[PDB]
Amino acid sequence: MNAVEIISRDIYKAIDIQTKILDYMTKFFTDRGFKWLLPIMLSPITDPLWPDPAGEGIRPAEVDVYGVRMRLTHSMILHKQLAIAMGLEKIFVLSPNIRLESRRKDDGRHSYEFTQLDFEIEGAKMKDVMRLIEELIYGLFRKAEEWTGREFPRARHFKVYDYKDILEEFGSDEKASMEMEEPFWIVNIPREFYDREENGVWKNYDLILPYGYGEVSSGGEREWEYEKIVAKIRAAGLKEDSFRPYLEIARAGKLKPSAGAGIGVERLVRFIVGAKHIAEVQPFPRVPGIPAVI
């Protein structure tokens, strides 16, 4: 769209919903003793987002800072681990991400700029995090019924499926979402080096919304051991050079076991207001493959 067209849309309802969602979610975490961090947008290191069945293997945008190449944040996952290393115990951030995805990813769920509420908990296990997310989501959906006067899935806990089993039964998480009428978990997905893997099993989880809305949250237990981390990076064809300061911290033995997740704020707003395309809930759309005018 062009500038004047963009500012001509009526998105007041979506923004009012977003405000209520942000109020609810931030209070959820501060009420439970989480510390609230500010984001970083530029770093020598960022989330590789690869390997990942959910991706095409994009490289992060980058810019020079005092002559040094910095990467724009793909996600703050490595920084969350470092925050745990600093003894903050339980942390969250409203983190903007920049992911220059292709036109193939303009499916109504993707934006090339977006924010996730990203959180991490020292010593947590996958079951603990999934239980916390269920509590947050159940509580939010009850609130959403008051806000909108419409009904939302009533489930207090969600069914759990192995990634491999999803592939076999539905073919893809896409079709699975299409068939379900309640949120559900997909677990054990081989992906990035930082998700914990133990004897062929991945200790990770994606929360999928029903009715074709697709993934809304993703997380895992983490790796913390240097030699294990380096082997995974190498096996994936990635370069140790891209993670140098982080691997220095790992080699020193300063990473601690932890688990966490990120929740897409815009994807959640979209679900609650029932928008067909995520661009409808953004004052300034960032459609994959289409450079925005404003």
The DSSP symbol for 33 reads T
By C-beta, is 27 or 104 nearer to ligand ATP?
104
- Is residue 101 marked as binding? yes
Of the candidate residues 46, 116, 204, 282, the single one contacting ligand ATP (CB under 6 A)? 116
Site size with Mg ion, rule: CB under 5 A: 4
Of the candidate residues 143, 232, 254, 277, the single one contacting a copy of itself (CB under 8 A)? 254
Q: What angle do CA 266, 285, 8 make, to 5 degrees?
A: 115
Amino acid identity for residue 26 in this structure: T
Is residue 118 at the binding interface for ligand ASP, with CB under 6 A as the rule? yes
**DSSP secondary structure string for all residues of 43-97:** ES------S-TT---PPPPEEEETTEEEEE-S-SHHHHHHHHHTT--EEEEEEEE
- Is residue 225 marked as binding? no
Q: How many Cβ atoms are within 10 Å of 8's Cβ, its own excluded?
A: 9
Of the candidate residues 174, 215, 238, 257, the single one contacting Mg ion (CB under 5 A)? 215
**Sign of the alpha-carbon torsion through 114, 20, 278, 141:** positive
Could you tell me the smallest distance in angstroms from the CB atom of residue 149 to ligand ATP? 26
Q: What angle do CA 70, 73, 76 make, to 5 degrees?
A: 120
Residue 19: helix, strand or coil by DSSP? helix
Of the candidate residues 183, 210, 219, 285, the single one contacting ligand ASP (CB under 6 A)? 219
Is residue 57 at the binding interface for a copy of itself, with CB under 8 A as the rule? no
Is residue 100 at the binding interface for a copy of itself, with CB under 8 A as the rule? yes
Is residue 165 at the binding interface for Mg ion, with CB under 5 A as the rule? no
Of the candidate residues 39, 44, 55, 190, the single one contacting Mg ion (CB under 5 A)? 55
Binding residues for AMP: 99, 101, 110-111, 114, 116, 215-216, 264, 267
